[PDB]
Structures are given as structure tokens and as C-alpha cells.
């Protein structure tokens, strides 16, 4: 009940209720049936203040879900620019791979999130990392027709961090 | 919020299956069945169906990455709309007897929604389109019933207002949606749709006409007006374009200018030259609308709206030759406009509800929102 | 009886194509060696 | 073409080996008004 | 040999000319014939163009197979109805010839991408012989009602193609293929065939219907069955996919299963609500087949179906035959129970046996069959442009 | 210059309206399905058949639409004036079908000069060629009284040789060795297959629309049906025969499969038996494939006549074959009318097409219509806004 209420508050962005639950003794690393903790839900919903507050209270940043997605993976797939920025600012691994081999850059490129793609490239995301299918962010952006993402990926090349 | 689309695995199938089961139950409780020209009568409805599915499905597939959704969602919309229009035209005109004429009229009512949806396609999911289909068919039936009750006309004959009703309904619904492009193979597929619409539009202008000479003259007038409108639209596209080039998108919408302009008066025009004059004037007005309407969301639906208004006005002009009837006809037009605007507003506020899981405004005009694609990360 | 026509007709087609292929096919075996 | 091989039907098989490779040319060389 | 295909095409055409000169002699049904013509040549042909590198072969071999098929089906169907004698040609002969072409194209759906045009000519000839014999059996010995041909056309073609594809099984293609994948514009093109089939199916089920109440019932029942089938196919495609996404295979094929499963009961007095029930069941069955039965057929039963013609034609065709039996049960038709059931069983069994024999013939390495790596590729038989 | 196209079009349309008001007044429903099929042929089959060019699909289908839309009006006017000897006439379904036939002739001629002309040039070519076609077909049908119900000569041969003459006059020295834009693409060829299939399916309506109701219309429909069926088989066989490694060519499958429908036109209503129509279709396919393989390169390089869609191999040679098939049919008894009149109709069609095409091309050779340069041939961007994404 307490963990479920805390996770619901994290999803809804109710930072006061989540802070109350953490005060009462709810473990911050608790996750739902899909392996998503409060950081994952806040990253999904774009709750930047909740993300920062949970990072302050020593949540495990590189905790993966049952699909292997980190909080940065979820924030890149959801296109939360500010959440991606804050997660990288707190030391999220931009080159993390999920179970199927997806990187945050791949999820940002497949979803036509140009701002996330640009920020990840500026933070040293390696676009040569392929999934288990052999697909790159450039390949998935070409397949999906994301022309701006394709152009930015080609123009960036290997400029690095 | 989250730009990744919310799962519709429980909303869309439950919604569609509930709709289909309700339609089955209503058909069982209220519908019933019961010669020489069976195939000839079937041909008009078949032409209407070919236009509604193919032409109105491919005509709005010019989008670089929304052709799948345009075509398939048009098919879904037609399939739902014909059944619901059968039931509602049975309810608001009397048990429901299903003839081929009733199916033809239901197809016309569905074409109204199919024309309206072109102003909102690319910005809605399937459930919002279901809501649009149901509410728009209901509003069109209510409009026809109100006209039949006030002006003492036939309910089925009031369906001549469907051009202007569909145009203003689509504009009003598109105005209420949240606010935010073309490729070559998608534009060619769209030319195919526009060509089928242009070729079979003389069937739109005479499904409700019983006398064979009236259908004769209506088809002749529509054919010649559409020819003149094609010539005027293709040639005048260069003038109404910043780079002085012909626009495939303008041609797709403007080829139907003559058919729209003479649709309400094709059976009253006595000579082909008058239909050709009306088609030429419709083409020139289409050029002017292309050159002016973007200055003052969909420009093609705006020019369709102005063309439908022009068609009603030329009906008003021609009916005097063939002043109380003038006032009555302007009143019928204004009532149709008011009901179209009000029902479009109601539909727009219904579509803005959070329960429909509408796509994010950054995800408009994208098939990836609704369709499965390989090599994609799915879920969280 | 009409079944025998489709059979006789099928037999004629099968006999022709088979014989033609058999001849050129054989001459290939005589020619390559 | 007139040498004896000593193999039964050797002349026949040598005749076939000599002429039948040119069968494709035997149809294309006929496309002329002289033919 | 590169000359096998032109040789067989020329020889078959000469045989058709001779047979027409030996057996053949010389307007209200012409629009329905033209609708069926559009179905046969555009709907099936472009429905199959979903493969990214097989569109040329799909549409062109569709045209070639159906063009040979209408002639050969005309000859075979006449010699049966004429009992070996000269017969005249009207609009109904043309409609039935296009029906035979439809059966062959449905079977071609099962072997798309893995067969040569020569194999296609051979299967056209043999399958038309088997189909015409089974159709004569159903229509004259059993005298069953199959006006939309859920049994004689759709189920027959599906199980004939399944038997052929089972005989032509390749071990290297069981785990999938790199070329066996759709493209975006390819699915856009396949929607053309889907839409034309959906639009003109009421003429397919009513072309040779008895004029009067039966033809009108066929038209109306087919139309409402398709209307319900579209909604149910969309709903179940969303249901079976992750996050409720729509699968283009489902929308392309399962949307037409209502026209297949209503064929037997098309002219019967099954009422529009009954036709809509049949269409909904057909759409659900087709989507479930595509999602679950096709992987089980490919991996476990070692039957690979390229276009999923089982889920569109066989299972909906079997459902249509069963619906005909049930309609006979509750007074919707005066045809016998046992004759409908015998028609279903004979159609399925004759299709399987003829497909076994035809596939055994097609397995001989004489027809230029493509290699495992060259399957679903136009370049084996076509000149392909450099750009898409 | 910048307004020549809209100004010429508006002047032509005002002329059409004035002529219609001066000369045009107002069985129909039994012939309407056939007219609908012919209309689908004209505006979809011909339009998408020429969309095989990778950078000319927009211009192909759009100029097809514009040319046919103008052509139906102008053909109605000219054919009605010729039939009524300058008197006012009432249009029926036959007038619509004949106007679409005139538009078909103009589109056949357009297939020869695809990619090398401007829309203004096509407006002028439509206007002149409809007059020439209507006069020749009036001569054939009324003075010669020949039987050409499928119009292998009045439509197909006439349009093919008219376009050949126009292309010969409009010859470009820089296009003799080919052009980088003169090649097909995958999806462009699929659209071309759309056009091919629609023409192929609805051709029986094309060949039987004018034919007298009864046995003649049924014979035309059956003969076109089986001739096209045989033509597909022979076109596929000879496409496999003539190309490298036996590979099939999309040009052959797209065009030579309609040769049987082209060549059966004169003998369509005649009693040649379905087997005779299958022989004509089988030869028509052979001749079309052989023409595409051999005669088109020789015409382009040696004779300086570049023909983009190969409309010679589809309409001219099969049209002359259908014309000659009609001569052998009257000789074999399958027809009324004289052999001399069929031969006169064939010769008049060819000669009038050549002379009128020479005159029309000389008119079109003037530098006033904005014809494209050598680089800009077969390119949509000369006249259309082309999307950046394919
Ligand atoms: C038409 C379908 C649904 C039912 C009947 C199909 C049966 C008869 C077919 C389809 C599956 C087929 C088998 C599939 C795979 C192979 C492997 C091959 O190396 C030898 C033949 C063999 C063993 C086939 C034998 C015949 C078979 C059993
Ligand atoms: C798929 C297999 C199990 C076949 C069963 C299909 C069922 C759902 C179909 C097939 C036959 C159909 C019936 C046929 C005849 C009747 C009587 C008629 O006056 C109304 C429709 C009604 C009541 C139909 C209802 C639906 C029905 C029962």
C-alpha cells in the first residue's frame, strides 16, 4: 500500500506525497510489477522536480526495468528534454544498452526527438552502437522517415563529446 | 507530458467491438429485407462506394508518413458510418427496410464524414474518428429531419446539403483540436484517389434523382463542369503559387471544383454551356482561394467550404429563373450552416477529452503513432 | 467422359513438354562431354 | 568428320557433338532477306 | 534452361488456341463481370505487392497466371458442362473463368516468393483441372449452394496452396528470410488491392446468383458482412499487438474475410444482422489466424504461407461452409445438410490431393526454382531499376 | 513567358464555352457502364501507364488529365460539327464516348513526346490533333464506310504515327544517346502497372462501346477478352526470349500486354471466332515485344525519331496489324464492306496522321511554349513543385 501509493505519487508528480512516503520509511528503490521505480515513472511523465528530488535521496540511477531500460532510456523514448538533461547532469550513462540492445540515442532517433538526439550526441552518445538486429539510430531514423534526425546524425558524424 | 503514445490495447478493441455488437443488436431488432434494373440501381451505390473508399481514402494520403492511417482509417470510417447511417436514417424517417437505395443514401451520409475527416486526419486516433463518425452522422440526420419538419421537404432529398455541411463540420472540428510534409509516391497515390473521385463524381450529383432525364442532365452538367474545372485548376495553379509551379496538392482538391459548384443545381441547368461557365468560375475562385485563404488550418477544406457556399448561392440564383422562395432557401442554408457549426463545436470539445489518448501535438502526421513497425523499441 | 478429355488434353501437354525437354536435355548431356 | 572411332554409334554421337552446339545460331543466322 | 519458360508459355498458348478452335463457339451481367475482372487483376495482384522486393513478380505473375487461367478454365469448365461437346461463350463463361483464375491466384498466395513463373504455369493448368472437377462435383452431383464459393474457390485455393507449399518446403526458410519483409510504400500499394477487393466483393458473390431475390440478398449480405468484418478486424488487430498498434498484414487481409465467410450464405435468407455476425466472426478468426496459426504452421507443421492465405481464404472459407450448414439447419435454405457437408469435405480433400500431386510435379529441378537466398526477390526473373 | 499556359488555357476554355453554347444542346443508361470503363481507361490507365519515368510521374499523370479534359470538350465540338454538317446537335452517350476516343488518340500521341514537351505544347497538340483525327475518322466511317469498331486505325495507328511525326520534328540532337532522367524506378513501375492493368481490364468496353447491340457487341467483348489473354502469354514469352539471361522487362509487361487489345479492334465485332482473336492477340504480343526490343532503338538512333513510351510498338505496329487483319477478314467473308475500303481507311489513317503530325510539330517547334532544355527533359521540377522526399 505504502509503496504503491509512493509509486502512484511519483507517476502523478505529487512530490509532497512522495516526500511524505519517503519520510515515513518507504524504500526509494521500490518498483512496480514491470520493474519501474519512482525515477522511471517521473522520467516517463516529465516530472523534473520529482526526478531531481529522488536523485537527491540516493535512488540508484542505473537501475534497469524488466526490459533493461534505465531512466535515461525511458526519458529518451518519451522525449522529455529537460528530464534527459537532468539525468545526464547527474551522471546517467548515455551509452547504456537495454536487453534488446537499444541505447537512449536509438530511442530518441526512432521517435523523432531531435532535441534529445542533439543533446545525447553532444554528451558523447556513440551512434555506431547497434541493436541485436544490427540496426543503428541512423538506420531506424532512415526507416521511419525522420529526416531531421537523419540529417543531424550525419552532420554530427564523430564529433564526440 | 509523455510524447510516447499511450497503449490503446484495451481502449480501441473494446470500443470497436462494443460498437459492432451494438450495431448487430440494433440491426436484429429494427432492420429487415424486402428486379429488372437491379444491377443498374446497384451501380450508382457501387460508384458511391468506390468514391468513398478509394478516392476519399487515397486523396488524403499525400502526407509523407500518414498514408497508411489515411487509407485504413477512411476504410474503417466508411464501414462504421454506413451501418450507423442505415440505422439512423431508418429511425429519423419513419421498421427499417434495407434496400439498395437506403444503402446508397447511407453511403452518401458516410461520405459527408469522410469529407469532414480530411480536415482532422493526421491529428486524431481511431477512437476520436469513431466519435466523429457517430456524432456527424447524427448531426446530418438531425439537420435533414429539421429541414423536413420546417420546410416540408422530403428527408432523403435534404441530403443535397451534404457538401456544405461536411465542409463546415470539418472546419469547426479542426479548429477545436490542439495546434501543431509531402512525398512523391504518396502524391501519386493521392492523384489516383483524386482521379477516381473526379471520374465518378457525376454519381454524387444524381443519386437522389428519380426521373431519368434529370439524371441525364445532372450527369452531363457535372461531366462538363468537371472538365472545365480540371483545365482551369491545372493551368491556374501556377498563378496561385509563390514559385510559379503547379502544385499536385492544389490540383487534388481543385479538380472537384466544378462538381461541387454545380452539385445542387446540375439538374436545373438547361444547357451545357452554363455548366461550363459555372465550372470555369469555380476554377477561378479556387485559384483565388489558394492565393488568398492562407493569408487570412487546411487550405483545401477552406476552398471546399467556399466552393460549397458558391454552389448553394448559384442554386439560389438559378431557382428564381425556374421572392419568398429566396428567403426560404437562404433560411435553409443558414440553418444548415448553424447546425454544422454547432455540431462541429460539440464534436471538437468531445475529441479534446483526455480519455481518447490523442497523439501528442509533436507526433501529428505520423504512422508510427498508430501502426506496428519493425526494429522499434516498444514499451518501458 | 469430359474427364477423359481433360486427361487426354493434359496427357498431350505433358507428353509434348516432357519429350521436348528430354531431347534438348539429352543433347546437353551428349554435348557437354 | 570421316574418321572411324571404333566405338558403336561413334560417328552419330560425334555428328551430334559437332553440329548441335550451333543450334541457337541456326535460328538467328536466318534473320536475313537472303534466307 | 533460360528457354523453358518461353517454350512452355508459347506451347500452352498454342494449345489454348487449338482447344478454342475445337470446342468454342459464340449483357445485363457485364458490369458485374467487370467488377470481378477488377478484383481478379488489381485486387489480388496489388494485394500481394506488400513484399519489398517482389512487387514486379507479384503483379506480373498475377497477370500472367490469371490470363492463362481464364482461357484454360473456360476450356475445362465448358467441356464438363458440355460433356465433351461444343459449347457457346457468354458472360457467365467469362465470369466462371475469372473465378478459376481467382482460385489459382489464392493458391499462388501460398507460394509467393519461392516459385518460378514456369512453376506458376504448371500449377495454373493442374489446379484449374482439379478446381473445375471439384466445382462440377459440388454444383451438379451434390447440388449444394455455394454461390459465393467459400468452399469451391476460397477454401479450395487455400488448401491447394498449403499442400503445394508443404511439398515445396525449404528447410533454410523456416526461421524467416531477409527478403521476406514489407516496406512502407509497398504496404501503401497493397492497400490498393485490399480496397478494390473490399469495394467489389458484393459483385463477386452475386455475379452468377439467380436473378431476383437471390442476387439482391447476395449483394446486401456481402456488403454488410464486409462492413462488420472491417470493424472486427481492426479491433482484433489492435487487440493482438503490443500497445494496441495496428498490423498492416491484418488490415490488408483480415478486412476481406467477411466476403469469404458469407459466400455460401450470400443468397440465403440469413438477414443483414446474420451477415454482420458472420463477418465479425470471419474478421476475428482471420486476425487470430494471422497472429497465432501462421507461426505454428511455418515452424511446427513446416507449411510456409507467404500471404497468409490460410487465414484469409481457408479458415474463413471453412467458416462459410459451416455457416451454410447451420443456415440449412434453421430453414434459411432448401438445400440438404449432407450435400453442404459433402461439398465442404470434397473441396478440402480434393484441394489437398491435387495440391500434393501438383507440388510433387513442381518439385522437379527443371523449372528454374530460386535458391534459398534468392527467395522473395524480383531480380531472379526481372530487370530491376537501380532506385526505388 | 510566365503566363502563356494559363492565358492559352483560359482562352481555349472560353472558346469551348462559346462553341458549346452555339452548337450543343441536351440507350444512355445501357451504354453508361461502358462509357464509365472507357473514362477509367482514359484518365487512369493512360495516365498511370506513363508514370514509369522516375522524375516525370507528376507531369505524366497531370498532363494526361489536362489533355484529356480539354480533349473531351474539343472532340465533342469537332465531331458533332462534322456529323451535323455545321448544325446544332444534341449530345448523347455516344458523343461522350467518341470524345473520350479522341482524347485517347491525343494521349497515344502524347506517349511519343513524353518528357520533352511543355503543357502549352500539349494544349496546342491536343487542339490540332483532335481536328485531324476527327476529319480522318469521319472520312473512314462515312466516305470509305469501313468497319473499325475498335479503331486500330482511326485511333491507335493514327495517334502513334501522329506522335512519331511530332517527335521527329521536335527531335533533339542531345537526346540521341539517352538521358539520365529517362529511366524507370520500382514504385514508378508499380504505378505504371496500375495503368497497364486498368487499360487491360477495361479494353473490351473500349472495343464494344460503339458496336451495335446484340451479337456485334458481344462478339467485340469476347474477342477483346481472349485476344488480350493470348497477348499476355506471348508478351511474357517473348520478353523472356529477347532479354539478357531471360529476365522479364517491365516495359514489355507494361505495354506489349495491351497489343492484343489494340490489334483486335478492327476485327472486334466481325465473326473471326474466339480462336482467331487469340491468334491476333498472340501475334500482337510477339510484334510488340520485338518492336520494343529492336525497332525502337533503330527508330531513335538511325531514324532520329525518339518515342518515349514506345507507342509505336503498342499502337502503330499493332494498329497496322489490326488493319491488315480486317482486310483478311472481309476476304475470308467474316465481314461486310470491301477490302479496298479497309485498305483505303488504313492508308488514309497513316497518311493523315503523318501529315497532320508534321504540321502540328512544326507549329510546336516555335520557341514560344516554354519547352524544356536538354538537361531538364523527363524532369517534373520544370513545371511542378516536387517534394524533397521521394
Ligand atoms: C493442405 C494442408 C493444410 C494439409 C495437408 C498437408 C500435408 C499432406 C503436407 C504439408 C506438410 C507436408 C510436409 C512438410 C515437410 C516435408 C519435408 C520434406 O523434406 C519432405 C516432405 C514433408 C515431410 C511434407 C510431406 C507432406 C505434408 C505433410
Ligand atoms: C462458424 C461456425 C460455427 C458456423 C456458425 C455461424 C453462426 C454464428 C451463423 C451461421 C448461420 C447463421 C444463421 C442463419 C440463419 C438464421 C435465421 C435467419 O432468420 C436470421 C439469421 C440466422 C439466425 C443466422 C444467425 C447467425 C448464424 C447462426
Radius of gyration of chain D: 14 Å
- Give the chain pair forming the largest contact, with residue counts: B-E, 58 and 58 residues
Q: Order of helices and strands of chain C, N to C?
A: H
Quaternary assembly: part of a larger assembly
Structure summary, number of beta strands of chain C: 0
Per DSSP, the total helix count of chain C is 1
Helix content of chain C: over 70%
Structural class of chain D: mainly alpha
The biggest sheet of chain D amounts to: none
> Which cofactor or ligand species appear?
cholesterol
Shape of chain D: elongated
The proportion of residues in beta strands of chain C is under 5%
Family (chain C): Belongs to the glycophorin-A family.
Cytoplasmic side (chain C): 24-33
Subcellular location (chain C): Cell membrane
Function (chain C): Component of the ankyrin-1 complex, a multiprotein complex involved in the stability and shape of the erythrocyte membrane.
Secondary structure elements and their pairing?
The structure is cut from a larger assembly and holds one copy of chain A (161 residues), one copy of chain B (380 residues), one copy of chain C (33 residues), one copy of chain D (35 residues) and two copies of chain E.
Chain B: H1 11-30, E1 31-32, H2 38-58, H3 67-91, E2 96-97, H4 100-116, H5 126-151, H6 162-176, H7 184-204, H8 212-236, H9 248-254, H10 257-261, H11 272-292, H12 299-321, H13 324-351
Parallel strand pairs in B: 1-2
Helix pairs in contact in B: 1-3, 2-3, 2-4, 2-7, 3-4, 3-5, 4-5, 4-6, 5-13, 6-12, 6-13, 7-8, 7-9, 8-11, 9-12, 11-12, 12-13
Chain D: H1 10-19, H2 25-28
Chain E: H1 4-23, E1 24-25, H2 30-47, H3 55-81, E2 87-88, H4 91-110, H5 117-142, H6 150-167, H7 184-204, H8 213-240, H9 248-253, H10 257-261, H11 271-299, H12 309-329, H13 337-362
Parallel strand pairs in E: 1-2
Helix pairs in contact in E: 1-3, 2-3, 2-4, 2-7, 3-4, 3-5, 4-5, 4-6, 5-6, 5-13, 6-12, 6-13, 7-8, 8-11, 11-12, 12-13
The complex binds cholesterol (2 copies).
Description:
This is part of a larger assembly, with one copy of chain A (161 residues), one copy of chain B (380 residues), one copy of chain C (33 residues), one copy of chain D (35 residues) and two copies of chain E. With 161 residues, chain A is mainly alpha-helical. Helix content of chain A is 54%, strand content 0%. Chain A has one domain. Chain A contains ten helices and no strands. In chain A, α9 (137-143) packs antiparallel against α10 (147-156). The longest helix of chain A has 11 residues, at 2-12. Chain B is an all-alpha fold and 380 residues long. Chain B has a single domain (10-369), classed as Ammonium transporter AmtB like domains (Ammonium transporter fold, Orthogonal Bundle), CATH 1.10.3430.10. Chain B is built from 13 helices and two strands. In chain B, strands 1-2 form a two-stranded parallel sheet. Chain B is globular and about 70 Å long. With 35 residues, chain D is an all-alpha fold. Chain D has helices spanning 10-19, 25-28. Chain D is elongated, with a radius of gyration of 14 Å. Chain E contains 13 helices and two strands. Chain E has helices at residues 4-23, 30-47, 55-81, 91-110, 117-142, 150-167, 184-204, 213-240, 248-253, 257-261, 271-299, 309-329, 337-362, and strands at 24-25, 87-88. In chain E, strands 1-2 form a two-stranded parallel ribbon. The structure holds cholesterol (2 copies). One cholesterol is lined by residues 270-271, 274, 277-278, 281, 319, 322-323, 326-327, 330, 332 of chain E. Chain D: It comes from Homo sapiens (Human). Chain D: It is found in: Cell membrane; Basolateral cell membrane. Chain D: Belongs to the anion exchanger (TC 2.A.31) family.
